[PDB]
Structure formats: structure tokens, C-alpha cells
Design a protein around this nucleic acid. Sequence first.
RNA 1: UUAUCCAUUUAUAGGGAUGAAUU
RNA 2: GAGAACUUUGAAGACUGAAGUGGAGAAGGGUUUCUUGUCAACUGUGAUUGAACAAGAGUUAGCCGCUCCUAAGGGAUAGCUGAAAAGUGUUUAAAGGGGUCCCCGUCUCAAAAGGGAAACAGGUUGAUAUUCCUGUGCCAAUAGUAUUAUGAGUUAGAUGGUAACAUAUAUAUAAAUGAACUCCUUUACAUAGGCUUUACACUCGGGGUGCGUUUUCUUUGCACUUUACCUUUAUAACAAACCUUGGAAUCAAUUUACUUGGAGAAGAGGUUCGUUGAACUCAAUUCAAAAAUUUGUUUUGUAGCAAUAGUAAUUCGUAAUUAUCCGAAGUGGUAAGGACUAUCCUUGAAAAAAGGAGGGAACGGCUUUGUGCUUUGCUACUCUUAAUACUUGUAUGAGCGUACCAACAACCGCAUCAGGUCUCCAAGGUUAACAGCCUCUGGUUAAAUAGAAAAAAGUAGGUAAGGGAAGUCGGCAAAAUAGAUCCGUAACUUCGGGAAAAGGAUUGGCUCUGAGGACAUUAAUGUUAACUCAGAACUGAAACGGACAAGGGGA
RNA 3: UCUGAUGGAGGAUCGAGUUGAUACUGACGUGCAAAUCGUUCAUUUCAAUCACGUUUAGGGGCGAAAGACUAAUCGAAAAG
Lengths: 60, 196, 76, 85, 106
Amino acid sequence: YLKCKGNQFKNKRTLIEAIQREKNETLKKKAIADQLEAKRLKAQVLRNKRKLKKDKEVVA
Amino acid sequence: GRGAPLAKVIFKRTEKYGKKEELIIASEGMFTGQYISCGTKAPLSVGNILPIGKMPEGTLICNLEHRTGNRGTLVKASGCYATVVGQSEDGKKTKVRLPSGAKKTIDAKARAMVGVVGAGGRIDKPILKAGVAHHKYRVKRNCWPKVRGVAMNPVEHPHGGGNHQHIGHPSTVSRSAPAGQKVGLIAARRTGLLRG
Amino acid sequence: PKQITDIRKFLKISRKPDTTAVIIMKKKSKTKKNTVITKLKLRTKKYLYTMVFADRKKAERIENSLLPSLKRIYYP
Amino acid sequence: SRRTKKVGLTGKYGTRYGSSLRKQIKKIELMQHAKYLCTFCGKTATKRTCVGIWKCKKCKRKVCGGAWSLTTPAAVAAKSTIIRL
Amino acid sequence: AQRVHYRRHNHYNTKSNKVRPVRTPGGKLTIHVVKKKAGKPKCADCKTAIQGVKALRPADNYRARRKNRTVARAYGGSICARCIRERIMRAFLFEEQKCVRQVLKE
RNA sequence: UUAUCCAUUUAUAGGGAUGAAUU
RNA sequence: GAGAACUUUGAAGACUGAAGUGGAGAAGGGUUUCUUGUCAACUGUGAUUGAACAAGAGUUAGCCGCUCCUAAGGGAUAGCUGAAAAGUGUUUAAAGGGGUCCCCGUCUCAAAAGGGAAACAGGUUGAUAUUCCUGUGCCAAUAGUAUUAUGAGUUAGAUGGUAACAUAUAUAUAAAUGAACUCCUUUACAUAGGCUUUACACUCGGGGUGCGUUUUCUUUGCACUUUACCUUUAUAACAAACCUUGGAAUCAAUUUACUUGGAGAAGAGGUUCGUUGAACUCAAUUCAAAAAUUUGUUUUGUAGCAAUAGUAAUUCGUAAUUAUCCGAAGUGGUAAGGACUAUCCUUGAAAAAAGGAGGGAACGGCUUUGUGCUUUGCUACUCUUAAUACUUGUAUGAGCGUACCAACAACCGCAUCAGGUCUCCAAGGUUAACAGCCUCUGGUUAAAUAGAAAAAAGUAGGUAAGGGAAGUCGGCAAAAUAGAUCCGUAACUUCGGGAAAAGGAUUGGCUCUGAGGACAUUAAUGUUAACUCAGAACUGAAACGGACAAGGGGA
RNA sequence: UCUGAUGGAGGAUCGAGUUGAUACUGACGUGCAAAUCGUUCAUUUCAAUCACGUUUAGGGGCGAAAGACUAAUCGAAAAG
Ligand SMILES: [Mg+2]
Ligand SMILES: [Mg+2]
Ligand SMILES: [Mg+2]
Ligand SMILES: [Mg+2]
Ligand SMILES: [Mg+2]
Ligand SMILES: [Mg+2]
Ligand SMILES: [Mg+2]
Ligand SMILES: [Mg+2]
Ligand SMILES: [Mg+2]
Ligand SMILES: [Mg+2]
Ligand SMILES: [Mg+2]
Ligand SMILES: [Mg+2]
Ligand SMILES: [Mg+2]
Ligand SMILES: [Mg+2]
Ligand SMILES: [Mg+2]
Ligand SMILES: [Mg+2]
Ligand SMILES: [Mg+2]
Ligand SMILES: [Mg+2]
Ligand SMILES: [Mg+2]
Ligand SMILES: [Mg+2]
Ligand SMILES: [Mg+2]
Ligand SMILES: [Mg+2]
Ligand SMILES: [Mg+2]
Ligand SMILES: [Mg+2]
Ligand SMILES: [Mg+2]
Ligand SMILES: [Mg+2]
Ligand SMILES: [Mg+2]
Ligand SMILES: [Mg+2]
Ligand SMILES: [Mg+2]
Ligand SMILES: [Mg+2]
Ligand SMILES: [Mg+2]
Ligand SMILES: [Mg+2]
Ligand SMILES: [Mg+2]
Ligand SMILES: [Mg+2]
Ligand SMILES: [Mg+2]
Ligand SMILES: [Mg+2]
Ligand SMILES: [Mg+2]
Ligand SMILES: [Zn+2]
Ligand SMILES: [Zn+2]
């Protein structure tokens, strides 16, 4: 909306192309960030289960 | 016609069931919805109306009576104020300093408003156009523009006539001159640029 | 003028002391043939009241049962 | 783009009246047409309606003030004096 | 095209002599004079338009229906609802504060 | 201070301690 | 007709060109208006004409105005001054009043453009028309008593909704108690800028009817195809404001521009005003389901007014009858409303009149001891609108204007004078254009004269070889330039300008190419517009803002 | 600080009406006219322009100032 108010698109077709390109890129960034966040979260369970595996033995 | 704003203020009748209306020159800071108090025992604050004998030294005042019960005569134009400068030993007298720089002693029971008159500082804008001055005096009185006496004929003015547009006469006249003759600088103690 | 779409109200108006005339208008429809549209109008002191009848049979019944003291006026 | 180097607001006056008078007009009218904080409601929406009357576009209170600005120093000084007492 | 003229006494274009052309069954253009608008009645406190009443010139207001000129509350069609709410709160709470202050004298 | 002059008001309590108010 | 250049009729050729010798009003005039007659003088030539002369006619209002209110102001009353004549106008009036026993507070005139109860369409005369005729409406007023009907309340004054708010449909939405006193609202208001909606106007294509052209062409060129006030008109649609729920940063919503939100935004669901005035299946009509409120369609109606009127046609007779009156869009001239933005040492009337609210005075009726307060029953009485009957002064709608001109010969200027003199309506083509030029509706073809001839001289114009201000006090007068698009613009400067500086190129017609939207079946298909802008080929006696319109530049 | 758009200020700019009157020292000068006619000029959002009503009266009024204007009369109107 603010882009169109600033005289960036002189035509309807150009606006459609621009929004499609932006949509693809903002989908790809999410699709990389979410998978990195999930994979990073997974390794928190091993790190928080080996703690109790050690502490059930030595810490008492 | 006037440069300063007016406050419309409503009091409540005390001898009877009803309401009454007043028009008062507004001091700088007043707002719609404010309660002001008028009387001999009212607290000292901006917009209250008090007798001048209950004000300490240095108080800035406006809308003053030069005689008691007068309903106000002295400090009224926009941006103007007076100063309390002395209280007498036995009461009954109060000394103030007026905007022109004169000093005066007043009855100590006369009334005034605390604060300065609003909308002050309006002679700091250049007028810059003849039409603006046409619109200024359009709502005051018929006194604009002005032809100068050196550009008339002798029948209409003491300065009129001549082959070169001069006065030819000393332009400072005396206090006793008749009505058709008191026309230049009236009873002038002094002429020229001031240097102090 | 005013319009009425309730038959009972129409017959109530006809019997009142200051109804003095009825108008009958017959007119072929603009769509087809054999379509005698009819309007019946009551002249009271204040307003004409108009009721529209699409059925020539029911309409033809209506003004038969209409009280004899009303003057009748035929426009077509 | 920037449409004017110097005269800014006084470009409506053209070439008339001389440069120094236009400078004083510019200084005065910068204050005259600005916005001021309303102390009653918190928004900055107070604008001048006449030579001494100021009004808030949101809460709709009217405050009596200066000619070209909302406060002049001389009134602020006296108010501070009274409040100190 | 067909051209028109004033039918009434006033022949000048004042605010009370406004005009609107109209086509007749006999096939001609004619003039008709237009009534002036009427301001909306306003709240006695905040000077805002009162909801639920009609805006009529006082001649048309005189012969208008009774329910078209009023609302059913403590101040009807003279003070708006926000103002009435604030008035009620002011009354009750200031009386409570005065009564609290009265007892504390001792 | 009573002649004389001025001012104010509906000639409306003798001096000191941004609700509503009438029968 | 005794007598026709300037009386009338028909046929031609032309003008006005909606900023009109077209329509309607004010000031001013006063019968100039209409019908008939008519020529002594007038109508600067004629005249049978005429605003001239003579006889008789013609102006119709509850709804158009005045009459009422107040304005800038005028005249007055008390008092005071002055020989008076006059000047001034609460300056210490025991005044003016209104309210039913009190309070408020001078009188009167001044607006035919300010304020302000109420009306429309068709027809009609030789001369008047929102005034007459026909039909349909509206506004204001309408005593007392009694009866009869319309509805409502109580067995002393009604209800619904959480809320914003809503409710009386009787022939007709007429009734929802309210005193003294008090407070508000309408009447009621400047300028500039763009955006938007709706009516009137204009235009394109279908259907019907009539007319025109027709050696050749032409599914063709023109005309008509209408719908007022009033019914709170019902209901739709829309710019706004407010209510309920909800709970906002990854800030959102949104305009051409803007604007707005924890003092409660978006989303979802509601209430009201304004605009407008049949839009929306709007109203009736069940074919069959859902109630002791639904589907395509029941099919009707220009929603009533309303076709019975108006217009265009075809008829038969010496007032007569029939058929049409209906399908889809575009352009943006004029007027009004809406929500906004901005400007001011400028902030842009009043009164008559009308409405809303606070407060709570008083009060169920009919006879029932007495002196307004003391005694017994019925738990029909209280409002409201309409009609009737009787008593009452005779229980609707006063008085004045209304013909005509408004300059072209009706006015002022000594006149039938090329002068002066206030307001509203406003078609087609070309075009930025209500300019100029040409045209349709309406108006005219008239001017104190005509025919012939055509030299000097004059007045208003048009051209000129070669030179180009040498003419003259002086480039006086006249020429040269000019629209729009694309390029390019100095000194100086108060930095805003100078500037259209100076300068250079292009412009017709015809045949094509490209760019800019909306909508519905799902990116894929389909329908469907308005006007501008940019390129290419071809073409002509090298011409093209072709007429009109339209800067000379510089030191 | 620079670039593109949006936006619509100003006693801004051309210009028809309106209000005026620069040149031809044009016509006319026994006029159409006791101030007209033609062409050419100045002005159009503001100190703008019109209409009615109203106030100011002669040695006085009114004047963005020319001794201008005050009913064809003004360096002191008109009637007796
Ligand atoms: Mg001089
Ligand atoms: Mg002298
Ligand atoms: Mg000099
Ligand atoms: Mg000397
Ligand atoms: Mg209501
Ligand atoms: Mg003649
Ligand atoms: Mg012509
Ligand atoms: Mg011509
Ligand atoms: Mg023209
Ligand atoms: Mg005649
Ligand atoms: Mg005759
Ligand atoms: Mg003659
Ligand atoms: Mg005669
Ligand atoms: Mg009459
Ligand atoms: Mg009238
Ligand atoms: Mg007055
Ligand atoms: Mg009067
Ligand atoms: Mg009027
Ligand atoms: Mg006539
Ligand atoms: Mg008439
Ligand atoms: Mg209709
Ligand atoms: Mg007439
Ligand atoms: Mg005369
Ligand atoms: Mg003559
Ligand atoms: Mg004439
Ligand atoms: Mg010649
Ligand atoms: Mg030649
Ligand atoms: Mg030559
Ligand atoms: Mg020479
Ligand atoms: Mg020589
Ligand atoms: Mg010389
Ligand atoms: Mg020349
Ligand atoms: Mg230059
Ligand atoms: Mg200008
Ligand atoms: Mg000459
Ligand atoms: Mg001339
Ligand atoms: Mg001289
Ligand atoms: Zn505020
Ligand atoms: Zn309110």
C-alpha cells in the first residue's frame, strides 16, 4: 500500500509481478528459519536427558 | 475591534433562584471548565479577582480599578500588566507601577485580576501590505489612509501651499493655540533622536 | 389519494355516512388480451380510496354487493 | 526533491517587500502554524484558532495564550513565582 | 432546449429562492421553489447533534408528531447520553466524598 | 458634614472569627 | 384601394445565431392594451399603415405579494436649555406592559431581493389566469351546554430493548397527568480548494408509427414515442455519528489530499439523522413445504395520482370510432446537498415565532346532618378525536395590487435622439473555451427617402518592381511575430526570479502497429466499453494552428 | 544532503465579459451626441465590482489631495 502511494508501479501487471516475487521470497525465508529452529530445538532433549541420566547415578 | 480575548463566565444568583452572565478580559492561562473565585478572602492564584491590599510585593496584575467599585479601568490592552511596588504602613493605600512607567497610589480596597492580559506580543509581526492595514481599520474607525499637510493647498492646512513642499514654519506649537492651529508637534519639550 | 389492499377494510369504508360515490374503471392490460383489469374507487370527504382487482369475476361480484345509495360513475 | 534552498515558507510572497521583512515574517509564522502539547489529554494536537485562542483537536478544550505561540515567557515567570509560594 | 422563468414574486437568486426544474405531463419544463435546509438540534453541554430527533424548520416542527421530537431518558432530547452518564457519576461520587469528609470532623 | 460635584446598582444582609442547589 | 418601392397574402434570396430586436420581472410611464371605424394635422419621401384621431370594452386569489418581525436609522414621551423658533433624548418618571392577586420592564415608523402558515396538473378568451372551469390536495381558526359514537387508562396518571433507542395506523399514528419558577435548542449566517452523489440538459444503438430522397447509392435522413403537487409516501442505497462483543508492535485501518486508535483500533453484529422519492419482488396473488415465518413461479400494477389527461397516427359522418405510448448505454454543461482541507493584527446580524427539558403545586365522582373543613353507599370515573341539537348579535377564509411597455419608437436626455439604465433561463459543429465563424427552435427582412450615372476630391479598405527610415521634432500610421508538441536558454539577482529570455525543428489526408479498465465460468476461457498518447508505410504543383483566432525581440 | 511523485499557496501570470480611457493629436465638429463613433489600449480573488436603503447642508459638508466634487452651476451652490 505504501509502495503504491509512492509512485513505484505505473501499471497493474507490474504490481502483480512484484507482489508475487516478494511472496515467494518471504515464503522461502520462513521455510529455512522454521526448519533450523525445529532442528535446533530437538537437540535440547538429549542434552536435558543425559543430565538426569548422570545425576541419577552420581549426584544422588 | 479589540486584540485581547474575552472570557465568558457564569455565576450563580444568591438573592434568588437563577444564573447570571459576565464578560471579562481573559488573562493568559485561563481555560474552559475552570473555576475562578472573586472576593476579599479568595486565594492568590492566576485568574482570581482580589483587592490589591491583600497582594504581596512583586505581584503582576491586570484589569484594575482606579477607584473602588468602578468595575475596572486601567490595565486592559493585550500583553500589558502592572506591578505591586508598595503597601502602606496602616493599609488604606497601595502603590503600583503602570505599563507606561508611571507610579500611582490607589485605595487599598480596589480590585484587580492576578496575571497578565492574554494574546501579548502582536506588534512583532510586520504588517507588510496596504490591504492588511485596510482590513485592520475596517473594523475600528475611519482614520486610514492619511494625506500629509505639505501636499494640500493653504485653504485646508497650515502646512499647505508653496513651490517646493516645505513647512516654512517652526513645527512645534504651544499648548494654548486655538483648535484650527494646533497641528504640528504639540507642546514639545524636545525634538530629535532620543539618546537615552 | 390512498390505496387499500384489504377487502374487509374496503367494504367497511363503503358503509360510512359520508361515502357518496364509486368510480369504476375498466382497461385492457398491456401484456396480452382478455385481461380486463379493474379499479374501484370510493369518494369520501377526505380521500379517494383505490382497490385494484386483477380478476374480472371477483371484481364484478364486488360492486354488485355495494350499497344502492352510492352514485356510480363509468369512465371508460 | 527539495524545492527551495532558503526562503522555505515565504516563497508565496515572490520577490516583494525586501529580504529582511520576509525573514521576520518567516520567523513569526513558523511559530504561528505549529502544533502544541495539550497538557489535559496528552496528545500534541493544539492549534491556533484566532489571535489569542488555542484549541485542542481531540479533547476540545480552549486555552487563552500568546499571539504567535501558546506561551510567552513573561506569563511563565509569574506563574512560577506564585506556585513557588 | 426549453428555457424557464420565475413563477413567484422574487426574481433574484437569494438563499430562500432556490430552484429545481421538473418535467410535466403536458411536455414542458417548469420551475419549482426549494425549501431551505434545517440545522440539527444540539446537545446542551457539548453542542453535538442529538440522536433520535428530526431536523425541521419551526413551522414544520410545530405540526410534527410528538414522538419525533424527544427521547425517553432523564433529559430526553436535550442532553446526550455520554453527558448524562458523566453527570450521574459526578453526583453520586461527589456526595460520597462530602459525606466521607463530614464524619472525619471528629 | 448638611450645601455643591462624581461613580455603581435590580439603589438586595450593620462590623469581626465543566453534577444539583428555588415552593 | 381614387392613388401602393416602405399595407396584407404566396413564392424566392438572406440576417439575428441562446452573451439573440427570444422569454419573464424591478425602477419609471399611465390606457400606450383589445375589437371596430378611420385620415384635417402628425407619422422630416410616399402612405390605404400607426404608439395619431373617434365609439365601445377589458384587470376575478384563504395557497402570488403587501399587510407582520427586526437592521443601518427616523419621529416622539420624561426631563433639561432657549425671548421663542427650535436642540437633545432616562441625564434620579409615582410612566408602559405582561402574568391573575404578582412580577416584568419606554412608545412608534423604517426591507414588494433579509426573516416568514399553506397548491398542483390539464382546459379556456378578441383582451386575465398557480386568480376563471374540471379534478385532486394543503394551512389556519372553530363558545357554552347536552347527547351519541372512536380509542386509552383504574378497579393519582401505559409499555418493549443489555444498550444506542422503539411503540397509539382509529375513515384520521388524536390522547402516555403535571402548576410557580429555571435552563437550553431551532430561526442563525465569511472566503478559497479539490473529491463525491442525485436531478435537469446533451448524445449512441434497438422496436413501433408517419414523412422525405430515389438517372446512380442508401436494411437509409427527419419527427413523436410524456407523467406534476400530495400519500409522516412505504421501502431500498449511501457519506457520517453512536451501541454490544473483542482486546491491538512484526503497528494497523484508510483518502485524490488526508485523518484515526488502551480517553479502546481492526473484524463481527446493531441504532439514528441527512440525502433521495417506487429504487428494492415493493404490494397483493399460497401451485405446493416450514406458523394455530419458505421456494422458481402462481401473475397482476406505469405503487395510489393515471389516462378518464397530453402527443403522434388511421378512421367514417353533417359531436362522432380505433392502434402506439417500450428495450440497453455514453458525455459532463447547470443547480443543490455531503464529508473534508486551508486562511485572517479580517473570525463574518437581530427579532417575531416554535420546540425540548429540570422541579413537583393540585387532584378517584355522584345528593347525604353543620359551620370551604365535620357524617353514610357504589371501587362507573378521567382523557381524546368526530358528528349532531339548542342557547347565544348575522358562528369560515378581510382589505389593496393584477391590462400593457420595459426600450427595438411606451423611461431620462426639449424628439419616434447611433447615448444612459438593475436581475433570472441558455441548443448543434469546430475548439482549451458561455471567444470568433456557420447552423436548429423562437424573431426579423426595419431604419428622417428612392432611380440612374460613374469624372475630380473626400472617407473606410486592398495591392505594388529595385532599395529599406535616406521621410519626420520623433518609425506617427502600417507591416513583421503569434496556437500546440519536442529541444535549448546569458548578464544580473533581495536566490523567490529574469523566462514565453534569446534561439532551432515539427504540424494535412489515408492505411496500419503498440500502451492505458470493468465484469463472470475458474491462472485458462467469455463478454464488454470511454477517450487520450506514442510509432510506421503511402500520398500531393513542398503544402497542412491552410479561413477564424493569435507576443515583435535585444544592449 | 540529493532524486521522483503528491499537494494547491500568492494584494502570482495571460485573457472574454465588467469597470475604464493610452494613441491615431482618426472621424465628426450647422454632430447620431451641449463629450458620440471606429480601431488600438488598461483591468478580472481582491485596497474587487454593482443595486436598493440610510447619514453628513453652504464660509458648511465630503476629499488615497486635482482647489477636486456637492442635480449641464464651485478659488464659496440654487430660489426669493
Ligand atoms: Mg497640489
Ligand atoms: Mg491658512
Ligand atoms: Mg519634497
Ligand atoms: Mg528658505
Ligand atoms: Mg423520538
Ligand atoms: Mg419611413
Ligand atoms: Mg449568420
Ligand atoms: Mg454576424
Ligand atoms: Mg458569442
Ligand atoms: Mg394596438
Ligand atoms: Mg386598428
Ligand atoms: Mg411624410
Ligand atoms: Mg388616443
Ligand atoms: Mg383580489
Ligand atoms: Mg404568499
Ligand atoms: Mg435601530
Ligand atoms: Mg414595520
Ligand atoms: Mg422575502
Ligand atoms: Mg396578454
Ligand atoms: Mg398569471
Ligand atoms: Mg409517480
Ligand atoms: Mg401580466
Ligand atoms: Mg424634463
Ligand atoms: Mg436625431
Ligand atoms: Mg433610442
Ligand atoms: Mg474611394
Ligand atoms: Mg495580389
Ligand atoms: Mg516595394
Ligand atoms: Mg534622418
Ligand atoms: Mg531630412
Ligand atoms: Mg524633440
Ligand atoms: Mg504604432
Ligand atoms: Mg532581458
Ligand atoms: Mg493579479
Ligand atoms: Mg481628433
Ligand atoms: Mg473612444
Ligand atoms: Mg495649483
Ligand atoms: Zn487535549
Ligand atoms: Zn453532550
